Each structure stands twice: as C-alpha cells, then as structure tokens.
Amino acid sequence: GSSGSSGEKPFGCSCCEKAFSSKSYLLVHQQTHAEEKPSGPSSG
Ligand SMILES: [Zn+2]
C-alpha cells in the first residue's frame, strides 16, 4: 500500500532492515552487530 521512506536513505544495512543517509552513520551502526551478538549459550 501507500508506503514511502522518510528522507533520502540510499544506504540500507545488510543484517537489519535499517536505512541511513550518510554511510558514516551506517558504519558506526554496523559496529553494534559486532557486539552482544545473538548467537550465544543463552546466559544472562
Ligand atoms: Zn544493522
């Protein structure tokens, strides 16, 4: 249906469905995926 993207975001993450405006931002965001990864023994 009628659905658009807020602001020009030609940059879209690969792991998630997030989008940014400037690569720089997207990059820093990727760092998160390099930590607290979901793949774990399941220990609080
Ligand atoms: Zn991401």
Swiss-Prot record:
Give the residues of the full protein shown: 273 to 303 of 947
Zinc finger C2H2-type: from-to: 11-33
Source taxonomy: Eukaryota, Metazoa, Chordata, Craniata, Vertebrata
Q: Where in the cell is it found?
A: Cytoplasm
| Self-association and partners | Interacts (via the KRAB domain) with TRIM28 (via the RBCC domain); the interaction increases ZNF268 nuclear localization activity. Isoform 2 interacts with CHUK and IKBKB; the interaction is further increased in a TNF-alpha-dependent manner. Forms a ternary complex with TBK1 and SETD4; the interaction between SETD4 and TBK1 is ZNF268-dependent and leads to TBK1 monomethylation.
Tell me what turns on expression of this protein: Down-regulated during erythroid differentiation by GATA1. Down-regulated by HTLV-1 Tax through the CREB/ATF pathway. Up-regulated by the regulator of nonsense transcript UPF1. Up-regulated by the cyclic AMP-dependent transcription factor ATF4.
Free-text domain note: The KRAB domain functions to reinforce the nuclear localization of isoform 1 in addition to its transcription repression activity.
Q: Which family does it belong to?
A: Belongs to the krueppel C2H2-type zinc-finger protein family.
The entry's function note states: Involved in the regulation of antiviral interferon signaling. During viral infection, recruits SETD4 to TBK1, leading to TBK1 monomethylation, which is critical for the assembly of TBK1 complex and IRF3 signaling.
What domain of life is recorded for the organism?
A: Eukaryota
* Name of the protein in its database record: Zinc finger protein 268
What tissues is it present in? Overexpressed in ovarian cancer tissues compared to normal ovarian tissues. Isoform 1 and isoform 2 are expressed in squamous epithelium tissues. Isoform 2 is overexpressed in squamous cervical cancer (at protein level). Expressed in blood cells. Isoform 1 is expressed in pancreas, lung, skeletal muscle, heart, placenta, liver, kidney and brain. Isoform 2 expressed in chronic lymphocytic leukemia (CLL) and several tumor cell lines. Isoform 3 is expressed in several tumor cells. Isoform 5 is expressed in fetal liver and several tumor cells.
Native source species: Homo sapiens
